[PDB]
Enzyme design. Sequence first.
Site, PDB file in Angstrom:
ATOM      1  CD  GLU A 131      -3.124   0.861   0.239  1.00 25.89           C
ATOM      2  OE1 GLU A 131      -3.096  -0.167  -0.462  1.00 25.89           O
ATOM      3  OE2 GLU A 131      -4.020   1.727   0.129  1.00 25.89           O
ATOM      4  CG  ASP A 148      -3.406  -3.133   2.914  1.00 18.22           C
ATOM      5  OD1 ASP A 148      -3.475  -2.358   1.935  1.00 18.22           O
ATOM      6  OD2 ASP A 148      -4.393  -3.460   3.609  1.00 18.22           O
ATOM      7  N   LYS A 186     -14.870  -8.521   3.647  1.00 17.10           N
ATOM      8  CA  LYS A 186     -13.540  -8.572   3.045  1.00 17.10           C
ATOM      9  C   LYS A 186     -13.088 -10.006   2.788  1.00 17.10           C
TER      10      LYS A 186
HETATM   11  C1  LIG Z   1      10.102   4.589   2.002  1.00 17.23           C
HETATM   12  C2  LIG Z   1       9.486   5.839   1.364  1.00 17.23           C
HETATM   13  C3  LIG Z   1       8.188   6.263   2.080  1.00 17.23           C
HETATM   14  C4  LIG Z   1       7.508   5.105   2.823  1.00 17.23           C
HETATM   15  C5  LIG Z   1       6.594   5.650   3.940  1.00 17.23           C
HETATM   16  C6  LIG Z   1       7.013   5.383   5.416  1.00 17.23           C
HETATM   17  C7  LIG Z   1       7.480   6.664   6.142  1.00 17.23           C
HETATM   18  C8  LIG Z   1       6.669   6.976   7.422  1.00 17.23           C
HETATM   19  C9  LIG Z   1       6.125   5.672   8.035  1.00 17.23           C
HETATM   20  C10 LIG Z   1       6.157   5.654   9.564  1.00 17.23           C
HETATM   21  N1  LIG Z   1       4.887   6.005  10.196  1.00 17.23           N
HETATM   22  C11 LIG Z   1       4.372   5.332  11.390  1.00 17.23           C
HETATM   23  C12 LIG Z   1       3.391   6.312  12.018  1.00 17.23           C
HETATM   24  C13 LIG Z   1       2.772   7.005  10.816  1.00 17.23           C
HETATM   25  C14 LIG Z   1       3.921   7.052   9.806  1.00 17.23           C
HETATM   26  O1  LIG Z   1       3.980   7.811   8.894  1.00 17.23           O
HETATM   27  N2  LIG Z   1       7.403   7.820   8.381  1.00 17.23           N
HETATM   28  C15 LIG Z   1       6.906   9.089   8.913  1.00 17.23           C
HETATM   29  C16 LIG Z   1       7.710   9.376  10.185  1.00 17.23           C
HETATM   30  C17 LIG Z   1       9.060   8.733   9.893  1.00 17.23           C
HETATM   31  C18 LIG Z   1       8.721   7.586   8.951  1.00 17.23           C
HETATM   32  O2  LIG Z   1       9.413   6.645   8.742  1.00 17.23           O
HETATM   33  N3  LIG Z   1       8.017   4.328   5.586  1.00 17.23           N
HETATM   34  C19 LIG Z   1       7.709   2.932   5.934  1.00 17.23           C
HETATM   35  C20 LIG Z   1       8.949   2.124   5.549  1.00 17.23           C
HETATM   36  C21 LIG Z   1      10.089   3.081   5.765  1.00 17.23           C
HETATM   37  C22 LIG Z   1       9.484   4.448   5.491  1.00 17.23           C
HETATM   38  O3  LIG Z   1      10.108   5.424   5.230  1.00 17.23           O
HETATM   39  N4  LIG Z   1       6.755   4.348   1.828  1.00 17.23           N
HETATM   40  C23 LIG Z   1       5.625   4.850   0.996  1.00 17.23           C
HETATM   41  C24 LIG Z   1       4.924   3.581   0.486  1.00 17.23           C
HETATM   42  C25 LIG Z   1       6.003   2.563   0.378  1.00 17.23           C
HETATM   43  C26 LIG Z   1       6.988   2.949   1.445  1.00 17.23           C
HETATM   44  O4  LIG Z   1       7.825   2.240   1.902  1.00 17.23           O
HETATM   45  N5  LIG Z   1       9.269   5.597  -0.055  1.00 17.23           N
HETATM   46  C27 LIG Z   1       9.188   4.287  -0.704  1.00 17.23           C
HETATM   47  C28 LIG Z   1       9.374   4.533  -2.199  1.00 17.23           C
HETATM   48  C29 LIG Z   1       8.910   5.956  -2.423  1.00 17.23           C
HETATM   49  C30 LIG Z   1       9.106   6.631  -1.071  1.00 17.23           C
HETATM   50  O5  LIG Z   1       9.122   7.797  -0.878  1.00 17.23           O
HETATM   51  N1  LIG Z   2     -12.586   2.477  -5.548  1.00 20.58           N
HETATM   52  C1  LIG Z   2     -11.417   2.539  -4.687  1.00 20.58           C
HETATM   53  N2  LIG Z   2     -11.424   3.321  -3.620  1.00 20.58           N
HETATM   54  C2  LIG Z   2     -10.358   3.382  -2.830  1.00 20.58           C
HETATM   55  N3  LIG Z   2      -9.264   2.679  -3.062  1.00 20.58           N
HETATM   56  C3  LIG Z   2      -9.190   1.853  -4.141  1.00 20.58           C
HETATM   57  C4  LIG Z   2     -10.261   1.758  -4.983  1.00 20.58           C
HETATM   58  N4  LIG Z   2      -9.939   0.881  -5.966  1.00 20.58           N
HETATM   59  C5  LIG Z   2      -8.701   0.435  -5.750  1.00 20.58           C
HETATM   60  N5  LIG Z   2      -8.233   1.015  -4.641  1.00 20.58           N
HETATM   61  C6  LIG Z   2      -6.910   0.792  -4.086  1.00 20.58           C
HETATM   62  C7  LIG Z   2      -6.756  -0.650  -3.647  1.00 20.58           C
HETATM   63  N6  LIG Z   2      -7.301  -0.647  -2.327  1.00 20.58           N
HETATM   64  C8  LIG Z   2      -6.668  -1.338  -1.244  1.00 20.58           C
HETATM   65  O1  LIG Z   2      -5.674  -1.968  -1.366  1.00 20.58           O
HETATM   66  C9  LIG Z   2      -7.431  -1.189   0.046  1.00 20.58           C
HETATM   67  N7  LIG Z   2      -8.708  -0.570  -0.109  1.00 20.58           N
HETATM   68  C10 LIG Z   2      -9.556  -0.382   1.074  1.00 20.58           C
HETATM   69  C11 LIG Z   2     -10.882   0.292   0.769  1.00 20.58           C
HETATM   70  C12 LIG Z   2     -11.789  -0.367  -0.050  1.00 20.58           C
HETATM   71  C13 LIG Z   2     -12.995   0.236  -0.362  1.00 20.58           C
HETATM   72  C14 LIG Z   2     -13.272   1.502   0.138  1.00 20.58           C
HETATM   73  C15 LIG Z   2     -12.351   2.164   0.945  1.00 20.58           C
HETATM   74  C16 LIG Z   2     -11.135   1.569   1.263  1.00 20.58           C
HETATM   75  C17 LIG Z   2     -10.088   2.278   2.158  1.00 20.58           C
HETATM   76  F1  LIG Z   2      -9.972   1.593   3.338  1.00 20.58           F
HETATM   77  F2  LIG Z   2      -8.872   2.319   1.532  1.00 20.58           F
HETATM   78  F3  LIG Z   2     -10.441   3.565   2.459  1.00 20.58           F
HETATM   79  N8  LIG Z   2      -9.108  -0.806   2.433  1.00 20.58           N
HETATM   80  C18 LIG Z   2      -7.802  -1.440   2.591  1.00 20.58           C
HETATM   81  O2  LIG Z   2      -7.393  -1.764   3.670  1.00 20.58           O
HETATM   82  C19 LIG Z   2      -6.949  -1.632   1.378  1.00 20.58           C
HETATM   83  O3  LIG Z   2      -5.694  -2.229   1.471  1.00 20.58           O
END
Ligand SMILES: C[C@H](C[C@@H](C[C@H](C[C@@H](CCN1CCCC1=O)N1CCCC1=O)N1CCCC1=O)N1CCCC1=O)N1CCCC1=O
Ligand SMILES: Nc1ncnc2c1ncn2CCNC(=O)c1nc(-c2ccccc2C(F)(F)F)[nH]c(=O)c1O
Length: 177
Positions: free
Chosen positions: A65, A93, A119
């Site tokens: 996700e 996810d 689900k």
């Molecule tokens: C790795 C980054 C961004 C990462 C998002 C979060 C950052 C958050 C999560 C922590 N949390 C927990 C509480 C809410 C929240 O935000 N943050 C915010 C505070 C510091 C931090 O780590 N992740 C998770 C893995 C390591 C990381 O960086 N994504 C986005 C989706 C895929 C992914 O891996 N990528 C991946 C490629 C493009 C990009 O830009």
């Molecule tokens: N018509 C669409 N609306 C939003 N997203 C769409 C999408 N079509 C494709 N996607 C992306 C693929 N979705 C996911 O992977 C995913 N979707 C949900 C979900 C499903 C229905 C209504 C709201 C939600 C959400 F919780 F996010 F708000 N929950 C999850 O936990 C999750 O993993």
Amino acid sequence: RGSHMEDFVRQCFNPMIVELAEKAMKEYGEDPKIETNKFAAICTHLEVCFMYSDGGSKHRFEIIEGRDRIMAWTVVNSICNTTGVEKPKFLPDLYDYKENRFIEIGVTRREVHIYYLEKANKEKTHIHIFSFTGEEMATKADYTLDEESRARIKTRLFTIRQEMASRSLWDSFRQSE
Ligand SMILES: C[C@H](C[C@@H](C[C@H](C[C@@H](CCN1CCCC1=O)N1CCCC1=O)N1CCCC1=O)N1CCCC1=O)N1CCCC1=O
Ligand SMILES: Nc1ncnc2c1ncn2CCNC(=O)c1nc(-c2ccccc2C(F)(F)F)[nH]c(=O)c1O
């Protein structure tokens, strides 16, 4: 029109999470400024997913996700050809490397039962549901993570619903799922 939901979503969630949510909503043809409860829901689903990935090992989970559609499918293909697992029909996810299974995270304002069952019809991919009132429900009662990790996620959900409540937005959010 300028929401109160939109402005609250912006100063409650992390800017990166808001942006990833605006991207996903726009990719599916929806407007964060119109359907604002969906905006809040997408941000919540995202943040919960991220904390989930945070609890646990250093890198135990692959995050699906958040990514764009094409790249997410790419990563799950690579996983499936690496671990020998059935390519899911719908995008999950996360993926647990420890337990070798895709995780579908759930965040619902209904009964954990009905959201799970709805689900569950959408087959080896684990399911895990949380709720704003503190309940969770997972496949084979295998909740994957430490008790404290899940407790923190639940606390966050509850503070979010409190913060909406004091702004009178909670009820509108609830009667929408
Ligand atoms: C790795 C980054 C961004 C990462 C998002 C979060 C950052 C958050 C999560 C922590 N949390 C927990 C509480 C809410 C929240 O935000 N943050 C915010 C505070 C510091 C931090 O780590 N992740 C998770 C893995 C390591 C990381 O960086 N994504 C986005 C989706 C895929 C992914 O891996 N990528 C991946 C490629 C493009 C990009 O830009
Ligand atoms: N018509 C669409 N609306 C939003 N997203 C769409 C999408 N079509 C494709 N996607 C992306 C693929 N979705 C996911 O992977 C995913 N979707 C949900 C979900 C499903 C229905 C209504 C709201 C939600 C959400 F919780 F996010 F708000 N929950 C999850 O936990 C999750 O993993």
